[PDB]
């Protein structure tokens, strides 16, 4: 009856929406590509920075070249959005629209040495996030299930590389000054915490071909693994760049072997649009609409927003603090022991340490 | 430049949007409406079966008229809908709507008394649900943060009332039996501790005039507490409907009230509709786009479907027995105690249960 009229709608209405799958594929694919580039310049910018223009420069060159070339191809493939484009998303590309003409200055400092290799990685980040919250809202507008799974797997895995080349850029300025204050340690943390989020969103939405190459491409790290534990545990060799370096290099080579994924999750998603555009009611309206699926997409820009905050940062410390002074009095840990434990039960339960702080802190009538 | 463009079209498109705001608000109400309609056929229903076809047959019979003439405002509401709707929302409308016409089934059973009182409120759940479901798609089309920013505190409040109707509900089973289950008991505090979030997000982003006529018409009831701790704890009455006559009255002035306010927030997001119709970019965005509001929006859909499903209510389930034993292990608690402390835990924190046992479970290397 009336039914069948919502239904055939729904159906026009989705039917159309096939024909954009190409343009927003592509979007999508060049989104990740300028940040793929933006990422390997702000690896350069930060060693030329880190090493007092001794090395990189070379690097920090040819990267801001590729980023001007991905650039392009960026804005060419915004085209095919300014007469389409929703107001959510068009606010979104404003805003991302509006940091890229930062490069100009951004680089002229960096180059020049006026500008601290912290202050540099913010801004490259900066532009990076506005960047990847295209993606979320990009999906907002896409009807087809099997698409918009694979949309939110694709971002997910991008966030969590992002937040990868993060960690690589906090632990090389900690490795280079031969100290992590407990603030640099703690956001070392908060970045390799929050790809756990990012790493398991991607493996329960992608396909298992996806996966497979994922497990076998990008197996841990024992190098990076030991270095992470001497940034937490330890002070680092004073060997004036050189451990640094080996970091670098070796997160480098993982930010490789995640792009070789990523590549191939944009190829999948490319040929799948193509695929389709070859032509109980509850549980069918579930996996039609994927509820759950596209708010894990919008709980992971949510985190990436957190980590950017310091209103966010500083409220988080406030429950963490707390949680060690729970430890320091129940327990008899010392400050440093008690935040080692709440680290440590942060990686083998896989959350971020507030999650810990604050589930102790729920149960603290039973201490 | 090409900012200005990109800005220039969002606000051009927002503007554009102003004039779908008075159906959408107009639908939103009377979706309101009806689904209070329903929810007062549903304690009807339930009273008549409980009560073996001895109480309730007026009631049952005027809330069935009532309810008709709602889904009539409600089918006009939905033509104006059409010519806007997304896909998603198309589909939200078609659920909601494939429900409806089986009203005259249930109603012939209810009169009948071939079915029994939780099936009966079951189903009279069920067609709420997805008739709830369709109000937080419509901000799928509104681009105004102020109007988007109502519908949400609104839902908020609308799935609260709707879990305080299965409250009532339940406890008068319950109350009817003389009995509390396992089970039984288990449902209703999942409904009790459900209305916390609901709430608290209606509290975080309704006007102050809002939530002040919340505080003052919706003042807690002792009554009714008092009752909670009866069917949580000991064996009620044997009392032959007495209990649970008193328990269904206590709810029923109680949901009125929260009715009283929701009409409220009708009218004001109305006006606010008509009044608009007649009129650092990370911090622009945000207050644009609502991120947080959206999210909250997110987490009550879940949280609804969690408490519609089996698998997911035994998922739950197996936390929290996981929980009592580790309080029956590292501290000697009776298996009834161990899930009395966390039911305890649980009010004491404003969470719900399985989030209770979440915590324990997370951080149980330290009793360990």
Redesign the interface.
Known sequence: ???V???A??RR??KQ?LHQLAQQGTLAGQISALVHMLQCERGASNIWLCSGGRLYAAECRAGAALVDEQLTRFYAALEPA?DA????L??????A??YLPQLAALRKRVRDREIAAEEATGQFSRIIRHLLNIVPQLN?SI?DPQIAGRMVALYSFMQGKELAGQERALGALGFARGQFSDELRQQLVDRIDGQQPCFDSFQALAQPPQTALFAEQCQASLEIEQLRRVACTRQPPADEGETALRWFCAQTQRLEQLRGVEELLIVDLLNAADALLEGS??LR??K??L??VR?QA??L??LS?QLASLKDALEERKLIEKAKSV?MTY?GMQEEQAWQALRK?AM??N?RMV??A???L??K??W
């Open positions: 009856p009336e039914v009229d919502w239904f709608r729904a209405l989705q929406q300014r484009a929703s107001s959510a068009c606010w979104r590309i404003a805003c629209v509006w907002d009807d009611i509850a309206l579930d039609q609409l509820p759950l708010q919008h709980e820009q949510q927003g430890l327990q039960m083998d339960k959350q999650e810990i604050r589930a102790l729920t149960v009538a039973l």
